[PDB]
Design a protein around this nucleic acid. Structure first.
Lengths: 94, 84, 97, 105, 92, 104, 78, 97
DNA sequence: ATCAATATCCACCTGCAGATTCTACCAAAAGTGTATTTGGAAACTGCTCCATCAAAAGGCATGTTCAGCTGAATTCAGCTGAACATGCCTTTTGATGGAGCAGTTTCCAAATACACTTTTGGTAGAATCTGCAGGTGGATATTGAT
DNA sequence: ATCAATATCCACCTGCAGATTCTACCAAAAGTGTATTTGGAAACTGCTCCATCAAAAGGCATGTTCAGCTGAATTCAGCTGAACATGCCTTTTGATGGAGCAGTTTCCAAATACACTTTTGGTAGAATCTGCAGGTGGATATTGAT
């Protein structure tokens, strides 16, 4: 009523990680939210398509990874594949 | 209310000049201003048309900022900073 | 009486507006333009203020982009003055028309 | 009761990302590693942009990141620029750039 | 295995040009066309339903999608044909 | 007894419905949506086939080939706008020479 | 192999594009552009191939790659 | 002792090639180029003939379009000879650069 | 412009042969009937936020003048790219036969979806804190006339 | 190579608009226990895909010769930039009613889920046809030249 979710707290955390002294105006946070939702939908829909082309009903981290490789360029992709693979194996270590 | 006419001319010559400057333009032929108005008018028609279509689809009378954001995303002019 | 040679103030304005980010079209005129175009498409419309704001930011970002490409066309023609045929060439290559 | 973000070593919300995938009509089923991987990639890209933007803020003697700093961060990095070469950042302006042929002779 | 739209394209061809045939490369192009437009319409209707927090794609979504994609024409006539096929369907 | 005949369509309503359910577009699919969508697909198909049959006639040909589909699309303002980012294999281009490059 | 894309073939492409006169430097510029194009499309295609655990690039892999690049192609699978 | 003036056969070839739809790059050289570029991404690959045909049709359509925009840029500069700066201007306006 | 020659291009008609078309039969969809589920339209209604309106004021828009220098002619010559014919070679074509390998088909164990119960992380306000937007000062370039 | 006019820094000062932090309910993650699959891991076909042969038939590479196009140099009318006077109309602050979003409920028409039956569309060996590609032979288009 009329409660609406955001990524702001998580953006702010990561912000404090990289630049502990620095803040972010709400307009810039607005931009950051648009960015996260945008990239989320690009990754998710490319993954949706990969799964469809291979008659597979499940989006796994393998799909998400191929999508990240198709969308991100170059050096951003190699670092994103690294961080994602690392988080998935850390997660499966219960 | 009051009748709306000729508002494209509210896009003044100094404003078009300023926009040219942010775009790095140094010298402007006298015919640019009426071209720019024409180009702007097409841009607005295409976006507002889509935005208002999203509005009509939701059985609303108020064009929301989300309607404009979706219209821009359809046109390949994705906009950050109003998205939510 | 002091006089800057033509082109000097133009370069000052390029430098100035390329540092800033504020909108360059006047708010109320633009709002009237949006309402006129919208009304000639469907009547009884209302607009969230932020919807007008989004339209203006999109529109100005678009026009500034177009003028960069226009400027490139003028220079390609060994000119310095953008002309309507420059905008037309830009919009043609961009696939807008 | 560990959170999945915690298990994954992440700040971004794995559970919420897993819920956005099921609700998003992307596929029937969603494996358990997909939201972890996706939250990881989203948090890394957020980190990369905020890094570059904070640097712009410092270069202009400011403590709070504003949209202009986000624009400079993106337009000055070839890869963020390609990633977002069709995105308009409200209140970001443009990069200072004057074609050489237009400067005094 | 490997269904196509060839049969239906050929029928429509005989409706508008009973005298005219079609090479298999051209039939390929017609297939690509039908699959393409299908995915554009379906994807826009999907988004339309999501923006309005609805779980059902109805002819209302399909229609608004058609208005959003075809210039209009070709959209006025598409809206005509669609409305017509739906009412002919609901009275049977 | 099929839904297409009931809708008066050559195109397959039942298949358009199965592709909408299976395509991950939404949870539920209304009963008229496959009908509507099938009608739109058949109408656009007819429009192109009409114009391409015409190009074929105009070339003393009875069988439509890709080139006739290209001439049909590029010569129609609206089909061209709808397909301005599509390449039709083996369709070629429209004859067009810039005035400035003509003799005398 | 890029040089196997010969000068007369680039001439023919230009002529279909309505070009009357061609500067001598156009041929190497064209080869560079063609090579960026193929690198971008093939890279994505082979990414689809690898995702499918195959050793054979399909026409469908090329068609999906071309649709990602905004170069949708009709007549080979979609 | 017969010679056509420069430009005459060129117009004749424009009229010919704008009328046909045949591929204008030779198949085998093209196939070598595709397989060579592919080898830097994944090794010992195989290609359906239809995948090679699809790539060639895509590339030839791309280059022909690019030459149209290039020609327009050259005309814009009051020339009739396309040059690399014409291709560069078109590719920039197109957003490929 | 209209004499004469060289090529080009255009029609009419011709006969193969590579693709269409028409004919002949089996699993996977498509239609039906029966029984539940449920999404979201209808019916109020709380309560943002949109459209108007009043008013005072200063930042800007409008018009005008004036001439600096830009764009558009015009000319011209060097040399770049077009048109050739001549030469030789890589592309094309078409099998034979070998094989690497997409596509089936039969799996079972890992992993996903359910489905209630228990927790807690995040959202929406109050409450408490603080970058920085402008405002005014004289350094330090920057331009443009002599 | 020097003033002078004007624009541009850059640092120092300070409370207010906007941010950062503090507090409480609830939607939503998490845990646990069930009951379906999924899509992998093996073992095998039949396609289609390289790898070669081995002719000839193109189509490309090479060097000649020059026509004509690009670019450099010069001119100059007048377009467009800079500066100025004048005063309008956008901004900004703030208030008001009420449209019309949006949040709760209630609850039927229309959705998903089966289970059974029956039809259709895809497949692979049936039977013709459309145009390609060569044949003329007749105008046409180009380009040289009293």
């Amino acid at each position: 009523r009329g409660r609406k979710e955001s990524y702001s707290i998580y953006v702010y955390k990561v912000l404090k990680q990289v630049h502990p002294d620095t803040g972010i105006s709400s307009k810039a946070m607005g931009i950051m939210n648009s960015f996260v939702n945008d990239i989320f939908e690009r990754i998710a829909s490319e993954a949706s398509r990969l799964a469809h082309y291979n008659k597979r009903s499940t989006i796994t981290s393998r799909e998400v990874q191929t999508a990240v490789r198709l969308l991100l360029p170059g050096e951003l992709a190699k670092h994103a594949v690294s961080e994602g693979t690392k988080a998935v194996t850390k997660y499966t270590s219960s | 209310r009051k009748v709306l006419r000729d508002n494209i001319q509210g896009i003044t010559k100094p404003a078009i000049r300023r926009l040219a400057r942010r775009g790095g333009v140094k010298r402007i032929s006298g015919l640019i201003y009426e071209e720019t108005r024409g180009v702007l008018k097409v841009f607005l028609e295409n976006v507002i048309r889509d935005a208002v279509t999203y509005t009509e689809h939701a059985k609303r009378k108020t064009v929301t900022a989300m309607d404009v954001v979706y219209a821009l995303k359809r046109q390949g002019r994705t906009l950050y900073g109003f998205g939510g | 009486p002091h006089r800057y040679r033509p082109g000097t103030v133009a370069l000052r304005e390029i430098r100035r507006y390329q540092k800033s980010t504020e909108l360059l079209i006047r708010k109320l005129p633009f709002q009237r333009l949006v309402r006129e175009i919208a009304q000639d498409f469907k009547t009884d419309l209302r607009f969230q203020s932020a919807a007008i704001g989004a339209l203006q930011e999109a529109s100005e970002a678009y026009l500034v982009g177009l003028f960069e490409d226009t400027n490139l066309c003028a220079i390609h023609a060994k000119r310095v003055t953008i002309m309507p045929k420059d905008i037309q060439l830009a919009r043609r290559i961009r696939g807008e028309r | 009761a560990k959170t999945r973000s915690s298990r994954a070593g992440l700040q971004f919300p794995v559970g919420r990302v897993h819920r956005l995938l099921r609700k998003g009509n992307y596929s029937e089923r969603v494996g358990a590693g997909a939201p972890v991987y996706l939250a990881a990639v989203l948090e890394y890209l957020t980190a990369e942009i905020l890094e570059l933007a904070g640097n712009a803020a410092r270069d202009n003697k400011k403590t709070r990141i504003i949209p202009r700093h986000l624009q400079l961060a993106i337009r000055n990095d070839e890869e963020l620029n390609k990633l977002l070469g069709r995105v308009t950042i409200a209140q970001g302006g443009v990069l200072p750039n004057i074609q050489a042929v237009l400067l005094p002779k």
